[PDB]
């Protein structure tokens, strides 16, 4: 696939582990990006991570122990980043 788009669902109020919400390649991947941008859902261009989630997981999986720590680091990072901009 020349383009990849993997979506992460995470709501700890409901469920402790994150989930693969979106899974698409090529044209559909481009459309997912355009739609997340339009609708305000953050897009992180992380090639190694995109590539390996694509290889290891499928739509609607829970994130497995192999990749969980990396995904969790991204999620904490995003929350911190939002918080830095939430007081300014």
């Amino acid at each position: 696939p020349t383009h990849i788009t993997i979506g992460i669902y995470f709501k700890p109020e409901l469920m402790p582990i994150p989930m693969i919400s979106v899974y698409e390649t090529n044209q559909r991947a481009l459309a997912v990006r355009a739609y997340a941008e339009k609708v305000g859902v953050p897009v992180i261009v992380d090639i190694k991570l995109a590539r390996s989630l694509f290889k290891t997981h499928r739509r609607y999986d829970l994130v497995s122990l192999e990749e969980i720590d990396e995904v969790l680091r991204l999620l904490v990072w995003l929350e911190e980043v939002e918080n830095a901009g939430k007081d300014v």
């Binding site: 979106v22 609708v39 859902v41 992180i44 991570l49 995109a50």
Partner: peptide, 20 residues
Amino acid sequence: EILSEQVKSDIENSRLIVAN
């Protein structure tokens, strides 16, 4: 067009999208 309402919904409910 190319994304169904299901996937749109799935995007809306995601924390993030990881892309290459």
